[PDB]
Each structure stands twice: as structure tokens, then as C-alpha cells.
């Protein structure tokens, strides 16, 4: 019998909401900051309850699906990560009614997967198609969501910078989802938010040039993945040294083989060299690097291992491990490589363009100090994601909790007109839909029960003539005062919870 | 030591094996339920499975009746392929039926002797459901696409199943009378999507060699070898290792350049255009290979080289024990085709028409490993289908059939033994209750509806579980393999009686 | 004296930040800002106990 | 516990050859004071074992300049060797002491 896994399910259904019920307060731009008590004990004022899930959580398998639920919303959208929490606990309320009714969870699973496919179809008709190749249409569509979000204090000047950034990788009108795996975020320690801009190719950190060039035209991007030293067990220079001759005879011979490997670099043609950390190897010999930099090659050193793997795929500098991999395809081809030392504190190397597949786009984040720099980082990336979610889903939907009240109004109607032993499941699926804007219409104030029934007063007759407007703090049409969102941040918040729900229904 | 008495052992066998049968009946069926994986040790990591074999691997089994089931779960896993979760619930369905007999008074040797005769009688009823499909090329083509949807959906792959469904049934079709797993080369590779997956007619190596070596070889002569260049193998040509001298290094430094020169002369005197080497090929013999037209492969697969000599008719060189007497392989076309993000070697037109290479293309490691394990479980059953091109009508339709035949024999025999045959025919009907619960329906309705079918003999139609409604058989998608159930009926009736044999359990740990 | 004392609650912790925020800027009204906010806490709580959104009172 | 002294002996053995370099380091700076005064007034040889081989002054300046650089290369690895062996053994002084107790 499934009676012992029956009790496991209701415990899992109850426990998944109980962590998610704190996010009901944290829902929306008028949502609540949630002060976190740490496992060692400390206060942490926190909003954006996906980050709360990453920070403080309990060890429960229904709760461990919740941190996975928001993480998928983080990587696919990055937005709607608070709303993706509230939809899943809303669906679990629908699950409790039907399991008490005596409906198999296999039935409740497949009914939700049908209604998910069915709801986004009707939601798409609610959406309006916007351009993805018109740069100006993308500008108006993005910043209205950016003014709809919390941070717009720096998103004003940083919206069109992101618009010009994505427009380079918008080659078709289809305009695929977006790789952020060519988008590099680069901090500059000084400078200004006004001086933040988009530098093509990739932007490097501190160079280490012994006698090397500063500005090389038509550079050759090289990679080094080999050591320049002796084996190490206790000492880098394994001598039992007490003598001047034994330290002279063996260490001049260490200079000998690194003479010949350095000459093979410049003869094959190299101007920019990618060197990882000397803890990612055993040692890197700077005297050979001095002789290398005396052969007029600009060199950076001490970069991360996986960060090179970002660089190799972005600018086409395919991995060079030895002398034999000195070729024309393993080496990238920059048009101009130089370092900018001025316009702000610090100094950052500029690979201004490279022979790159697609378009390698890099932003330089500036600011007074690190906290001011970190303000723009959320400001750019949220601006990057709202463009990213609109090029994934062509049409645009006005945001503000109203299309859920729209869609639940149709899905109750269609589930009656369709048929079903599972018709209750879809009609309970639609009853879960208006929970989330109701919990949003608590954070706006202005009683949500009185609120939510008067939006589908307008969604039934005029199909929308009033909305929930956090600008007004309540009843105002999201088409009257424009509150919009991409289509993806609503759909991706919707579909991941449905896939999560059908799993835990089938989970014993 | 703890000597478990029989009154205690029956309680332990009932809590031991049935709870395991509770888990595998959840993860049966594509519509069926799942199971959260809770690691028995510290830091329990969670996965969600539709496979009962992984549950036994994660969650440790130390129930002595259920530890017998782990051995039975392994046999249908490896030798049979599909049928792992099905054999383990079915023995539990037997043991539930034995409970009321044990509750009455009844000896288990009554219960064993009844189920032995009932198994062989239903086995002939299982042979009554044997229907050929190799009588037509088209019906055997229709036979392969039937079972390919069955095994893959049973072992957690249903989203991109149909792209693998078209490719796998083609390579099994070239086997033609002989079931082969050493002719079907199985290659997983990251890159592309699951619609980018590929079927090569012949053999494949994942070698990026470019234009330094010949990649276009027409009318090939294939030397299958393991002869290195710097390893200084058997049949010595110069110096050997020695001590107690300081000036003997000059004979060792010079002898390496002669051996690498001589092995180029050895390889060319075969007459080949392709030297396949398991070991690394040094740069100086490698550049001597591409100019003459000898293909050079370094870092070859340890199992791929041995499968290469079978499909091409060649032979391994046995680590240079055969310098010339090693036979050569021959194929039609050797072509470098970029499949996905990678440059691949396609040995096309090999000497075996049975020989093929499926090329799995997963976008990540999470989808690629789970695809091959389901696909390897499919091709083992499909190779058994090459020997016997037969089906039995799935969806519990054959389960309803054989339980009637036992019931007829239980209503002709019934001395002492066929009290168990009455409990036997219920446990066969207990399996379609699971699938109706996997589909999530009235199992008591659908069985008694299906019991009414095979009572007069409506055998050509059983329950299509996607709606749970009765539907067509003899190919539907749900009409299952003959080779699977004859193994599942064999093992489940076997070990459940063995559990009835062990009443004298003694725990000394 | 709050700088002399040590905090006990995070509720006690956040207000020691607030009076010091007043005290760094000016020396007047520094002990007064503590008393005003605590009066707000009892006033809004009864309304939240009554029927009122916490969002609505702080507006 | 043998693991306590073993990380110390591997550290202290490297220090003894490193302290050898520092007196050589000072005298490598002494000879550069003396090579700067020579411009052709006195030529230099090289004392290498049982053979005393002729040098030049520019040949001498590079010679002691290299040996100055090889000392500094062995200084920096010991700073890695110092912090690693003192931190690994510090973790070992807590865990391996509990092994002998129970």
C-alpha cells in the first residue's frame, strides 16, 4: 500500500509551503525585508527571497527542491525569482484538496502539465508582440520594466548601454535566448557610473611586463599551459645546498631549456600571452619571462583556470598546452591590444576587438569604491536579463499580477468546457493562480480579497481596465501607468513550479 | 549468534521484502510514481528516480529476504536488461499471497509445490502468447519500434526518446538473424543536442586528426595494433637496460632513433593506409605516416581497438608479438565528418554489415549518461529479439491470460498443492493493479474488466494505460517483448520460493 | 550610553545604529530619535492587530 | 606523532641551505662593489673547483649577477614552504593528538 508514502507526501507538501510562506511577505517591490538569523547566530537584513533560500534553509527534500526552483529561475531569467517561490506553494494548496478528495497524484501531475501548456497558450494571447531587431523598441521595453523594479537609480543611464551590448549579438530577428557566456563583467576600481561603458573583445586585469610592449597593433593572443621549472617535493630548487658550485651547475642548466621554449613563442608569432596562476602550476620562471618580455611581447600573469576557459571560447583562442600547439587557430587575433591606466583608479588591459566567433561583448563597471561598483553590477545584470528574457520570448506582457487574474479566469472557464475527472484539478490549478497577486495585494496594502475580485471585474468585461500598481500602491491599470515585464519571467516562473509539483506528487 | 525462528522469520520476511516491493511498484510505468533517494549514510544527497535498481544502490538493503531480491534484481538488470523493477514487485506480490496461507496454518512446501507447477503451466500459456514478427521485414520493422518505446520509457527517458527510437531500430535491423552487442559500438559524446545524435554504418573513433594524417581513405587496409614508439617493446633491436657503468648512455641514446625508424619500415611493409595505435605516436614517425598515406591514431580506446579487429576482420598485433603475421582489416570508406562540435572518424563500409555505431549527443552530462544506460538496456533486449522475433501482449494483458490458465489448472488439480495455485493466479493479477495505480485508476475496475476479457478469450486487446482504456495489442507500443517476461516469470517465482525456504535464519553479525 | 552598552536583540541592534546616525551628524536630538520610533511601534501594532496592513501605516 | 616532527624537519632542512645563501648574498653584493672599481685595472678569473679559469669584467658582472638571482629564487619558494608547513602541521596538532588519547 502507498499509505506510508501517503503520509510522507502530505508532510512534504506541508513543509515546502512553510519555508515558502515567509516569501509571501517578501513578495514584490513593496515586499518585506527578511532579517536572517544565521546558523552560528547573526542578523542579516535580506530581501529577494531566492537569496534567502540560498543563504538560510533547512535540510528537507521538499525544501531542497525550493532552492533548486529559484536557482533555475536565477539562471534562465534571474527575475521573477520571488514569484517562482509563491506559485509552487500555491499549487500545493490545490494538491491538498484533491488528495483529500482521493485523486491519484499521477492524475494531478498530468492535469497540471496539460494546464501548464494550456495556460501559457492563453497567456500568450494576452501578451503583445514587440520588436527584437529595432534597437529603440528594445530600449522602451526594457527600462519600463527597469523602472518597475526596485533599482532604477542607476538603471537609467545603464539601460541603453545594455541595449547596445545585446544589439551586437542580435544578428537575427529570432534573436536567441542569450549566452551570458560571452558577456564579461569587469570592475574598474575608480571611475564613475557615468564612465561605465562597453569595450569589445575582453578586458583584462593587471599585466606583468618585464620589458614587454604596452600597445601592440594586430596582436596574437597566446596561451601558456606549461611549467618552466624543476620538480618539487619540499623545495622548488631541490638542492641539499651548502655549496656554491652545486647551486651554479644545476641552475644555469635550468636557464638553458627555458631559453629554447621562449624563442618558440615569438617565432610562431605572439603578442599577448595568457598566463594563469603559479599555484595553478608549480612555478613560472620570471627570468625566462624577462627574456620573453625582452622579445617584445605583452604578458598578463596569474589568472584563474576556469576563467581562461571563458576566454578560450569567447575570442577563439583555443587551448595551447605546449610548443606544438603554437598554431594559427589556437592563437587569437586581436586588432589592437593595450592597457588603459587612466580614466579612473587602477589599470585594466583592453583587448579592443578580437577574431571572435559571434560577438564577444564586455562591460567595464566603474565607481568610486567597491560598494558603488557593486551597485552598478546589479544595475547592469538586471538590465541584461530583462533584455535577455524578451529576446527569448518575442511578445511582451504587462506585469503587475493582473495576467494571473486574467488567466485563472479563463482556465476555470475552459476546464468546465473541456471535460474532466481532472477538470477539478485544472479548476484548482487556476485557484492557485490568483493567490500570488493576492499576496502581492497584501504588500501593496488595500485589502487583497477586495482587490483580487475587482481585477477580474475588469478582466471579465473589458479584459483588463484595472491592475495592481505599486506606484499607486493599489488599484490602477498597468496599461494606464505602464508596468510591464518580459514574457519569459512570467512563464519561466510558472513552468518550473509545475514541473516541480508533478515530481513531488510522484515522489513517495 | 541470533537464531531467528520461523515465527519471527515470516514477520521479518514480510516486512523485509514487501516494503521493497512497495518501492519498485511506485517507480513502475511512465505514468507511475517516483522515489526520492535518501542516502543511508551521512550528508544524504537526493535524486528523484523512476528506477528501482538505483534505489537498491543508494539505500542499503540489510533485510535477508530483500537481500535475496538484490541478487534477483541484478540478473534481470545485466543479463536481461529491462525487467528489473518488474521482477522484484512480482515476487512481493507472491509473498503477500502467501500471508493468508501462513495465517491459516499452511506449510510453505505446500506453497512452493503449488507455485512450481503453476509457473510451468503459465510458461506454456506464455508460449501460447508467442507470436512471430520476423515473418515479414515490415512486421519485424514494426516489431522493433514497438519495444524501443517500452524499455526507454521504463528507464527514465521519454522526452527525446523518439529520436533515439528511429536510430536504434535501424542498427538492430542490420544484425539479421544474429543478436550482436560487439557489432553495435556505443559512443557517448558531449556536444550537440539530442536531435543531433547520429548512426554510423560501421565503426567510429572520436579522434581529431585533421589534415596532418590521411582522413580520406578509400579501399582501406586496417592494421589493428598496440605497438608503441618510445616504449621499446618486445623483439629487441638494440640496447637493453644495464647498470654499473657511466659511458653506456651513448648506445641507449642512439638506439631510440633506430627503433622509431624501423617501425616506420615495419608499418609500411604491411601495405596499410591506416595504422591504429593504442599508444602515443611520436612526432617523427607521425610525420612519416601522413606523407605516404598511412593514418596515425594515438590514444586509442582500450575497448575500441578490440572491437575494431572484430568488425573489420582484422586481428590485434598482441603488443608487437606479431610483427607481420597480424592480419589486416578492410573497409570501404574512411571519412572525417564533423558531428556536433567535434571532428569524428567514421569507418564506413566495414566487412560486417551487422556492425554499426550509435552516436549519442547530449547537451550535458546529466542527460548523456542516463540516455546510454537506458539505450544499453534496450539493445540487449532487441538483440534477444533478433534470435526470437516474438512478442507478448503487454499492459498486463498476458498477465490476465496466464492467470486464467493457472486458474483452469487450479480447478482441475487441487489437492494439497493448488491451494498455492489459487494464490498464484491472484499475484499475476496483482501486477495489472499496479499499472492501473501507476496510471492512477480504479485497479479493481480495470482488472475485473480485463478479467472479463480473457475469460471468453479476448486476448488480442488489453488496457492501453495512457488512458487506462482497453486497446489494441500484438503491436501497440504497449505490446511488450517475449524475451523479457519469460525471464521475469522465471526469477520472481524462483526467489520467492527460496524466501519460503529460509526459515532457519541465523544472524551472527 | 547606548554606545557604552552592548546590544541584545537585532531590534536593539538596529536602533543603536540609528541614534549614532543622529549623533555623528549633530549632538542635538540624539536621544530623542530613539523615543519617537518606539512610539511608532506601539501605535502601528494595534492597527496591525486591528485589521491594518503593515504597508499601509508606514505610508 | 611522527607527523609533527616530519613537517618541521622538511622545513628546517630548507632553512639551513637558505641561511647559507644569505652570507653569499652579502658577498655577492661585496664583489659588485669591487667589480665596479675595475674597468681594466685588474682582470678577473673564475675559481671553479681544481681549475682556475679566465674571466672578463663584464663576464664577472653577469656571473655574480646570476648567482644573486638564483638565491632570490630560492628565497621566495621558502616563503611558500614556510606558511604551508606551519599551517598543515597546525591542523595536524589538533587531530593527531586526539588519536593517541582515545
PDB file of C-alpha atoms in Angstrom, chain A residues 70-268:
ATOM      1  CA  UNK A  70      14.678  29.583  -7.628  1.00  0.00           C
ATOM      2  CA  UNK A  71      18.159  28.723  -8.937  1.00  0.00           C
ATOM      3  CA  UNK A  72      16.632  27.638 -12.235  1.00  0.00           C
ATOM      4  CA  UNK A  73      14.760  30.945 -12.191  1.00  0.00           C
ATOM      5  CA  UNK A  74      18.105  32.618 -11.477  1.00  0.00           C
ATOM      6  CA  UNK A  75      19.876  31.085 -14.457  1.00  0.00           C
ATOM      7  CA  UNK A  76      17.053  31.117 -17.003  1.00  0.00           C
ATOM      8  CA  UNK A  77      15.689  34.531 -16.098  1.00  0.00           C
ATOM      9  CA  UNK A  78      17.196  35.975 -12.935  1.00  0.00           C
ATOM     10  CA  UNK A  79      13.871  37.780 -12.455  1.00  0.00           C
ATOM     11  CA  UNK A  80      10.607  36.537 -11.035  1.00  0.00           C
ATOM     12  CA  UNK A  81      12.719  34.629  -8.512  1.00  0.00           C
ATOM     13  CA  UNK A  82      10.486  35.751  -5.668  1.00  0.00           C
ATOM     14  CA  UNK A  83       7.353  34.949  -7.677  1.00  0.00           C
ATOM     15  CA  UNK A  84       8.616  31.468  -8.601  1.00  0.00           C
ATOM     16  CA  UNK A  85       8.533  30.665  -4.879  1.00  0.00           C
ATOM     17  CA  UNK A  86       4.936  31.760  -4.362  1.00  0.00           C
ATOM     18  CA  UNK A  87       3.441  29.859  -7.310  1.00  0.00           C
ATOM     19  CA  UNK A  88       4.724  26.497  -6.047  1.00  0.00           C
ATOM     20  CA  UNK A  89       3.261  26.825  -2.558  1.00  0.00           C
ATOM     21  CA  UNK A  90       0.020  27.995  -4.161  1.00  0.00           C
ATOM     22  CA  UNK A  91      -0.159  24.797  -6.222  1.00  0.00           C
ATOM     23  CA  UNK A  92       0.387  22.675  -3.105  1.00  0.00           C
ATOM     24  CA  UNK A  93      -2.816  24.142  -1.682  1.00  0.00           C
ATOM     25  CA  UNK A  94      -4.593  22.742  -4.737  1.00  0.00           C
ATOM     26  CA  UNK A  95      -2.884  19.388  -4.167  1.00  0.00           C
ATOM     27  CA  UNK A  96      -4.190  19.023  -0.609  1.00  0.00           C
ATOM     28  CA  UNK A  97      -7.819  19.398  -1.670  1.00  0.00           C
ATOM     29  CA  UNK A  98      -7.618  16.712  -4.323  1.00  0.00           C
ATOM     30  CA  UNK A  99      -5.654  14.178  -2.284  1.00  0.00           C
ATOM     31  CA  UNK A 100      -8.229  14.599   0.476  1.00  0.00           C
ATOM     32  CA  UNK A 101     -10.785  14.122  -2.290  1.00  0.00           C
ATOM     33  CA  UNK A 102      -8.992  10.918  -3.260  1.00  0.00           C
ATOM     34  CA  UNK A 103      -7.413  11.735  -6.611  1.00  0.00           C
ATOM     35  CA  UNK A 104      -4.251   9.917  -7.677  1.00  0.00           C
ATOM     36  CA  UNK A 105      -1.151  12.134  -7.823  1.00  0.00           C
ATOM     37  CA  UNK A 106      -0.383  10.698 -11.248  1.00  0.00           C
ATOM     38  CA  UNK A 107      -3.698  12.221 -12.315  1.00  0.00           C
ATOM     39  CA  UNK A 108      -2.907  15.534 -10.610  1.00  0.00           C
ATOM     40  CA  UNK A 109       0.548  15.533 -12.235  1.00  0.00           C
ATOM     41  CA  UNK A 110      -0.617  15.083 -15.833  1.00  0.00           C
ATOM     42  CA  UNK A 111      -3.501  17.510 -15.347  1.00  0.00           C
ATOM     43  CA  UNK A 112      -1.112  20.262 -14.289  1.00  0.00           C
ATOM     44  CA  UNK A 113       1.272  19.521 -17.158  1.00  0.00           C
ATOM     45  CA  UNK A 114      -1.649  19.871 -19.554  1.00  0.00           C
ATOM     46  CA  UNK A 115      -2.901  23.051 -17.874  1.00  0.00           C
ATOM     47  CA  UNK A 116       0.628  24.475 -17.926  1.00  0.00           C
ATOM     48  CA  UNK A 117       0.762  24.008 -21.701  1.00  0.00           C
ATOM     49  CA  UNK A 118      -2.795  25.342 -21.842  1.00  0.00           C
ATOM     50  CA  UNK A 119      -2.275  28.363 -19.598  1.00  0.00           C
ATOM     51  CA  UNK A 120       0.779  29.751 -21.382  1.00  0.00           C
ATOM     52  CA  UNK A 121      -1.145  29.477 -24.658  1.00  0.00           C
ATOM     53  CA  UNK A 122      -3.892  31.781 -23.408  1.00  0.00           C
ATOM     54  CA  UNK A 123      -1.291  33.943 -21.643  1.00  0.00           C
ATOM     55  CA  UNK A 124       0.482  34.397 -24.980  1.00  0.00           C
ATOM     56  CA  UNK A 125      -2.696  35.881 -26.470  1.00  0.00           C
ATOM     57  CA  UNK A 126      -2.703  38.294 -23.526  1.00  0.00           C
ATOM     58  CA  UNK A 127       0.821  39.321 -24.474  1.00  0.00           C
ATOM     59  CA  UNK A 128       1.629  41.859 -27.157  1.00  0.00           C
ATOM     60  CA  UNK A 129       4.379  41.316 -29.750  1.00  0.00           C
ATOM     61  CA  UNK A 130       7.341  43.694 -29.594  1.00  0.00           C
ATOM     62  CA  UNK A 131      10.429  44.046 -31.743  1.00  0.00           C
ATOM     63  CA  UNK A 132      13.776  42.405 -31.135  1.00  0.00           C
ATOM     64  CA  UNK A 133      15.734  43.936 -34.023  1.00  0.00           C
ATOM     65  CA  UNK A 134      14.527  47.500 -33.507  1.00  0.00           C
ATOM     66  CA  UNK A 135      17.085  48.853 -31.042  1.00  0.00           C
ATOM     67  CA  UNK A 136      14.730  51.648 -29.993  1.00  0.00           C
ATOM     68  CA  UNK A 137      11.774  49.334 -29.303  1.00  0.00           C
ATOM     69  CA  UNK A 138      14.088  47.288 -27.082  1.00  0.00           C
ATOM     70  CA  UNK A 139      15.027  50.479 -25.224  1.00  0.00           C
ATOM     71  CA  UNK A 140      11.443  51.422 -24.332  1.00  0.00           C
ATOM     72  CA  UNK A 141      10.519  47.847 -23.430  1.00  0.00           C
ATOM     73  CA  UNK A 142      13.455  47.289 -21.083  1.00  0.00           C
ATOM     74  CA  UNK A 143      13.520  50.465 -18.989  1.00  0.00           C
ATOM     75  CA  UNK A 144       9.794  50.350 -18.216  1.00  0.00           C
ATOM     76  CA  UNK A 145      10.463  47.030 -16.520  1.00  0.00           C
ATOM     77  CA  UNK A 146      13.604  48.597 -15.032  1.00  0.00           C
ATOM     78  CA  UNK A 147      11.574  51.472 -13.626  1.00  0.00           C
ATOM     79  CA  UNK A 148       9.072  48.843 -12.484  1.00  0.00           C
ATOM     80  CA  UNK A 149      11.795  47.137 -10.441  1.00  0.00           C
ATOM     81  CA  UNK A 150      13.419  48.450  -7.273  1.00  0.00           C
ATOM     82  CA  UNK A 151      16.723  49.737  -8.671  1.00  0.00           C
ATOM     83  CA  UNK A 152      16.284  52.396 -11.341  1.00  0.00           C
ATOM     84  CA  UNK A 153      18.645  54.900  -9.719  1.00  0.00           C
ATOM     85  CA  UNK A 154      21.491  53.698 -11.938  1.00  0.00           C
ATOM     86  CA  UNK A 155      19.448  51.701 -14.455  1.00  0.00           C
ATOM     87  CA  UNK A 156      18.511  54.889 -16.341  1.00  0.00           C
ATOM     88  CA  UNK A 157      21.887  55.511 -17.978  1.00  0.00           C
ATOM     89  CA  UNK A 158      22.713  51.812 -17.885  1.00  0.00           C
ATOM     90  CA  UNK A 159      19.663  50.628 -19.798  1.00  0.00           C
ATOM     91  CA  UNK A 160      20.860  51.819 -23.281  1.00  0.00           C
ATOM     92  CA  UNK A 161      24.407  50.583 -22.621  1.00  0.00           C
ATOM     93  CA  UNK A 162      22.928  47.115 -22.184  1.00  0.00           C
ATOM     94  CA  UNK A 163      20.715  47.734 -25.228  1.00  0.00           C
ATOM     95  CA  UNK A 164      23.742  48.461 -27.427  1.00  0.00           C
ATOM     96  CA  UNK A 165      25.502  45.451 -25.905  1.00  0.00           C
ATOM     97  CA  UNK A 166      22.827  42.899 -26.809  1.00  0.00           C
ATOM     98  CA  UNK A 167      22.194  44.548 -30.207  1.00  0.00           C
ATOM     99  CA  UNK A 168      25.638  43.382 -31.322  1.00  0.00           C
ATOM    100  CA  UNK A 169      24.675  39.775 -30.611  1.00  0.00           C
ATOM    101  CA  UNK A 170      21.191  40.258 -32.044  1.00  0.00           C
ATOM    102  CA  UNK A 171      22.021  39.087 -35.544  1.00  0.00           C
ATOM    103  CA  UNK A 172      18.590  37.556 -36.445  1.00  0.00           C
ATOM    104  CA  UNK A 173      15.085  38.721 -35.672  1.00  0.00           C
ATOM    105  CA  UNK A 174      14.540  35.411 -33.860  1.00  0.00           C
ATOM    106  CA  UNK A 175      17.325  36.601 -31.500  1.00  0.00           C
ATOM    107  CA  UNK A 176      18.200  33.567 -29.302  1.00  0.00           C
ATOM    108  CA  UNK A 177      17.954  33.340 -25.608  1.00  0.00           C
ATOM    109  CA  UNK A 178      21.179  34.909 -24.661  1.00  0.00           C
ATOM    110  CA  UNK A 179      24.551  33.494 -23.739  1.00  0.00           C
ATOM    111  CA  UNK A 180      25.911  35.360 -20.770  1.00  0.00           C
ATOM    112  CA  UNK A 181      28.966  33.207 -21.532  1.00  0.00           C
ATOM    113  CA  UNK A 182      30.255  35.851 -23.869  1.00  0.00           C
ATOM    114  CA  UNK A 183      29.197  38.729 -21.583  1.00  0.00           C
ATOM    115  CA  UNK A 184      32.050  39.573 -19.226  1.00  0.00           C
ATOM    116  CA  UNK A 185      31.543  41.935 -16.297  1.00  0.00           C
ATOM    117  CA  UNK A 186      34.745  43.821 -15.463  1.00  0.00           C
ATOM    118  CA  UNK A 187      35.235  46.050 -12.427  1.00  0.00           C
ATOM    119  CA  UNK A 188      37.352  49.172 -12.536  1.00  0.00           C
ATOM    120  CA  UNK A 189      38.209  50.374  -9.041  1.00  0.00           C
ATOM    121  CA  UNK A 190      37.953  54.073  -9.812  1.00  0.00           C
ATOM    122  CA  UNK A 191      35.965  55.895 -12.443  1.00  0.00           C
ATOM    123  CA  UNK A 192      32.285  56.744 -12.396  1.00  0.00           C
ATOM    124  CA  UNK A 193      28.924  55.157 -13.188  1.00  0.00           C
ATOM    125  CA  UNK A 194      28.811  57.807 -15.935  1.00  0.00           C
ATOM    126  CA  UNK A 195      32.119  56.413 -17.234  1.00  0.00           C
ATOM    127  CA  UNK A 196      30.913  52.803 -17.403  1.00  0.00           C
ATOM    128  CA  UNK A 197      30.911  51.567 -20.981  1.00  0.00           C
ATOM    129  CA  UNK A 198      31.159  48.590 -23.324  1.00  0.00           C
ATOM    130  CA  UNK A 199      34.606  47.502 -24.523  1.00  0.00           C
ATOM    131  CA  UNK A 200      34.600  44.801 -27.172  1.00  0.00           C
ATOM    132  CA  UNK A 201      36.572  41.588 -27.024  1.00  0.00           C
ATOM    133  CA  UNK A 202      37.621  41.000 -23.435  1.00  0.00           C
ATOM    134  CA  UNK A 203      39.007  43.356 -20.793  1.00  0.00           C
ATOM    135  CA  UNK A 204      41.939  42.045 -18.779  1.00  0.00           C
ATOM    136  CA  UNK A 205      43.283  42.808 -15.326  1.00  0.00           C
ATOM    137  CA  UNK A 206      46.865  43.697 -14.302  1.00  0.00           C
ATOM    138  CA  UNK A 207      49.531  42.884 -16.879  1.00  0.00           C
ATOM    139  CA  UNK A 208      53.022  41.806 -15.847  1.00  0.00           C
ATOM    140  CA  UNK A 209      55.543  43.082 -18.399  1.00  0.00           C
ATOM    141  CA  UNK A 210      59.263  42.910 -17.588  1.00  0.00           C
ATOM    142  CA  UNK A 211      60.426  44.649 -20.795  1.00  0.00           C
ATOM    143  CA  UNK A 212      57.239  43.984 -22.749  1.00  0.00           C
ATOM    144  CA  UNK A 213      55.270  46.216 -25.087  1.00  0.00           C
ATOM    145  CA  UNK A 214      52.355  48.359 -23.885  1.00  0.00           C
ATOM    146  CA  UNK A 215      50.420  48.996 -27.117  1.00  0.00           C
ATOM    147  CA  UNK A 216      50.742  46.348 -29.837  1.00  0.00           C
ATOM    148  CA  UNK A 217      48.765  46.641 -33.073  1.00  0.00           C
ATOM    149  CA  UNK A 218      47.394  43.414 -34.617  1.00  0.00           C
ATOM    150  CA  UNK A 219      48.278  41.287 -31.604  1.00  0.00           C
ATOM    151  CA  UNK A 220      48.370  37.499 -31.396  1.00  0.00           C
ATOM    152  CA  UNK A 221      46.528  36.151 -28.357  1.00  0.00           C
ATOM    153  CA  UNK A 222      48.578  33.328 -26.876  1.00  0.00           C
ATOM    154  CA  UNK A 223      48.141  30.802 -24.071  1.00  0.00           C
ATOM    155  CA  UNK A 224      50.757  29.137 -21.857  1.00  0.00           C
ATOM    156  CA  UNK A 225      49.973  25.836 -20.128  1.00  0.00           C
ATOM    157  CA  UNK A 226      53.447  24.541 -19.296  1.00  0.00           C
ATOM    158  CA  UNK A 227      55.885  24.902 -16.401  1.00  0.00           C
ATOM    159  CA  UNK A 228      59.338  26.493 -16.532  1.00  0.00           C
ATOM    160  CA  UNK A 229      60.960  24.855 -13.508  1.00  0.00           C
ATOM    161  CA  UNK A 230      62.120  21.746 -11.663  1.00  0.00           C
ATOM    162  CA  UNK A 231      60.002  19.160  -9.815  1.00  0.00           C
ATOM    163  CA  UNK A 232      59.044  19.978  -6.229  1.00  0.00           C
ATOM    164  CA  UNK A 233      58.687  17.697  -3.210  1.00  0.00           C
ATOM    165  CA  UNK A 234      59.923  20.052  -0.488  1.00  0.00           C
ATOM    166  CA  UNK A 235      61.818  22.691  -2.480  1.00  0.00           C
ATOM    167  CA  UNK A 236      61.248  24.385  -5.822  1.00  0.00           C
ATOM    168  CA  UNK A 237      65.014  24.141  -6.363  1.00  0.00           C
ATOM    169  CA  UNK A 238      65.695  20.681  -4.910  1.00  0.00           C
ATOM    170  CA  UNK A 239      69.285  21.087  -3.760  1.00  0.00           C
ATOM    171  CA  UNK A 240      70.781  19.979  -0.453  1.00  0.00           C
ATOM    172  CA  UNK A 241      72.687  23.238  -0.927  1.00  0.00           C
ATOM    173  CA  UNK A 242      75.701  24.141   1.194  1.00  0.00           C
ATOM    174  CA  UNK A 243      77.972  24.874  -1.756  1.00  0.00           C
ATOM    175  CA  UNK A 244      78.336  27.474  -4.496  1.00  0.00           C
ATOM    176  CA  UNK A 245      79.310  25.147  -7.334  1.00  0.00           C
ATOM    177  CA  UNK A 246      76.403  22.721  -6.950  1.00  0.00           C
ATOM    178  CA  UNK A 247      73.971  25.637  -6.952  1.00  0.00           C
ATOM    179  CA  UNK A 248      75.706  27.068 -10.017  1.00  0.00           C
ATOM    180  CA  UNK A 249      75.975  23.976 -12.203  1.00  0.00           C
ATOM    181  CA  UNK A 250      72.351  22.831 -11.939  1.00  0.00           C
ATOM    182  CA  UNK A 251      70.656  26.233 -12.009  1.00  0.00           C
ATOM    183  CA  UNK A 252      72.383  27.519 -15.140  1.00  0.00           C
ATOM    184  CA  UNK A 253      71.012  24.366 -16.761  1.00  0.00           C
ATOM    185  CA  UNK A 254      67.535  25.369 -15.602  1.00  0.00           C
ATOM    186  CA  UNK A 255      68.036  28.583 -17.574  1.00  0.00           C
ATOM    187  CA  UNK A 256      69.073  26.522 -20.608  1.00  0.00           C
ATOM    188  CA  UNK A 257      65.825  24.768 -21.517  1.00  0.00           C
ATOM    189  CA  UNK A 258      63.687  27.821 -20.764  1.00  0.00           C
ATOM    190  CA  UNK A 259      65.825  29.742 -23.241  1.00  0.00           C
ATOM    191  CA  UNK A 260      64.646  27.469 -26.040  1.00  0.00           C
ATOM    192  CA  UNK A 261      60.945  27.343 -25.180  1.00  0.00           C
ATOM    193  CA  UNK A 262      60.685  31.150 -25.040  1.00  0.00           C
ATOM    194  CA  UNK A 263      62.160  31.511 -28.544  1.00  0.00           C
ATOM    195  CA  UNK A 264      59.477  29.181 -29.927  1.00  0.00           C
ATOM    196  CA  UNK A 265      56.773  31.572 -28.712  1.00  0.00           C
ATOM    197  CA  UNK A 266      57.813  34.677 -30.657  1.00  0.00           C
ATOM    198  CA  UNK A 267      58.864  32.831 -33.828  1.00  0.00           C
ATOM    199  CA  UNK A 268      55.381  31.344 -34.163  1.00  0.00           C
TER     200      UNK A 268
END
